[PDB]
Design an enzyme around this catalytic site. Structure first.
Site, PDB file in Angstrom:
ATOM      1  N   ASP A  35       0.817  -1.200   0.000  1.00 56.28           N
ATOM      2  CA  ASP A  35       0.000   0.000   0.000  1.00 56.28           C
ATOM      3  C   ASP A  35       0.859   1.261   0.000  1.00 56.28           C
ATOM      4  O   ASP A  35       1.369   1.672   1.046  1.00 56.28           O
ATOM      5  CB  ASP A  35      -0.908  -0.023   1.228  1.00 56.28           C
ATOM      6  CG  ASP A  35      -1.803   1.185   1.322  1.00 56.28           C
ATOM      7  OD1 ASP A  35      -1.887   1.933   0.327  1.00 56.28           O
ATOM      8  OD2 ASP A  35      -2.425   1.367   2.398  1.00 56.28           O
ATOM      9  N   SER A 199      -0.490  15.571 -12.116  1.00 57.42           N
ATOM     10  CA  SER A 199      -0.726  15.191 -13.496  1.00 57.42           C
ATOM     11  C   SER A 199      -0.941  16.447 -14.340  1.00 57.42           C
ATOM     12  O   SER A 199      -1.451  17.456 -13.857  1.00 57.42           O
ATOM     13  CB  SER A 199      -1.936  14.255 -13.578  1.00 57.42           C
ATOM     14  OG  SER A 199      -2.310  14.001 -14.917  1.00 57.42           O
TER      15      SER A 199
END
Length: 330
Positions: A35, A199
């Site tokens: 994770d 992004s």
């Protein structure tokens, strides 16, 4: 040193991935959920409340000659889905794919929430975010990657998740045979303890690319792609019959529909998520309504590039003095 381990979807929808991990001496092998959105290595154990264990493999520290109680230490964690676990702490030898850390904090669960009990396939979590998120008290503990880092050939690990298939976690090296083209690296902020990056935009299907900054985290422990409501609305508008359902808790679509791809930007480069990756199947057995793999982050407080996004790429988690993230097509 290096390590290399195969990671396997827990079910036919890729709802999560498990990776075998050796703990203690002799080795006890547990299947952990790696994770990159948390920083605790915790396991089902011989100390876990009996009624809360249902099929999981447990760690028994009393059977390990290298286990040592971390005296006075406790831990307690809650995840974004509302699940939780807590307990005490041992140190022990932990190996992943041939890579061994001695003195790793292994957090033994005394309690787990129902979501964990009900999932027989996940024996615990292995956190790979930054150690500043680790919940051990009074002395914060380091992640497996943090402990291994100095020994690694290169201070990196990579995530290569499969679509409806096994993939690979590598530690300490970049497998240049595992991706196409080049790896594009992008800046990381560690201020919230996550692999947080920006992004450069998105496209829906064959549509034109929209240049826009989207801050979010690279999180292998989140299944879906969570993005701003504007982005997500633009995607599902291209799917006939799709709707946001408050009763179901997200966008759903008829299973007869074709899903467009979704492209996200990494610097000047582009990662394309095929439409099929965005299908998470019937909302309930036998239903013609399918759950979408791209959902709104509104109300989470952060955008999450979960497995839906990451499995479309070869992803480098670069833990150099200034961390960065790399993405390649594959």
């Amino acid at each position: 040193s290096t390590g290399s381990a195969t990671t396997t979807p827990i079910d036919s929808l890729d709802d999560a991935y498990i990776t075998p991990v050796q703990i203690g001496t002799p080795a006890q092998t547990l299947n952990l959920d790696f994770d990159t959105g948390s920083s605790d290595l915790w396991v089902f154990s011989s100390e876990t409340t009996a009624s809360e264990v249902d099929g999981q493999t447990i760690y028994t520290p009393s059977k390990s000659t290298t286990a040592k109680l971390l005296s006075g230490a406790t831990w307690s964690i809650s995840y974004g889905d509302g699940s939780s676990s807590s307990g005490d702490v041992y140190t022990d030898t932990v190996s992943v794919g041939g890579l061994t850390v001695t003195g790793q904090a292994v957090e033994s669960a005394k309690k787990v929430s129902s979501s964990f009990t009900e999932d027989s396939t996940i024996d615990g979590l292995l956190g790979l975010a930054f150690s500043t998120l680790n919940t051990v008290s009074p002395t914060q503990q380091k992640t497996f990657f943090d402990n291994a880092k100095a020994s690694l050939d290169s201070p990196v690990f990579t995530a290569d998740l499969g679509y409806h298939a096994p993939g690979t976690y590598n530690f300490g090296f970049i497998d240049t045979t595992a991706y196409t083209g080049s790896i594009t690296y992008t800046a990381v902020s560690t201020k919230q303890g996550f692999w947080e990056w920006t992004s450069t935009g998105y496209a829906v299907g064959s549509g034109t690319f929209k240049s826009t900054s989207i801050d979010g985290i690279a999180d292998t422990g989140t299944t879906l792609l969570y993005l701003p409501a504007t982005v997500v609305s633009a995607y599902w508008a291209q799917v006939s019959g799709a709707k946001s359902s408050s009763s179901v808790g997200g966008y759903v679509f008829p299973c007869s529909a074709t899903l467009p791809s979704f492209t996200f930007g990494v610097g000047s480069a582009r990662i394309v998520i095929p439409g099929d990756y965005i299908d998470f199947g019937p909302i309930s057995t036998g239903s013609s309504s399918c759950f979408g793999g791209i959902q709104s982050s509104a109300g989470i407080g952060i955008n999450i590039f979960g497995d839906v996004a990451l499995k479309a790429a070869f992803v480098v988690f670069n833990g150099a003095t200034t961390p960065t993230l790399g993405f390649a097509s594959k």
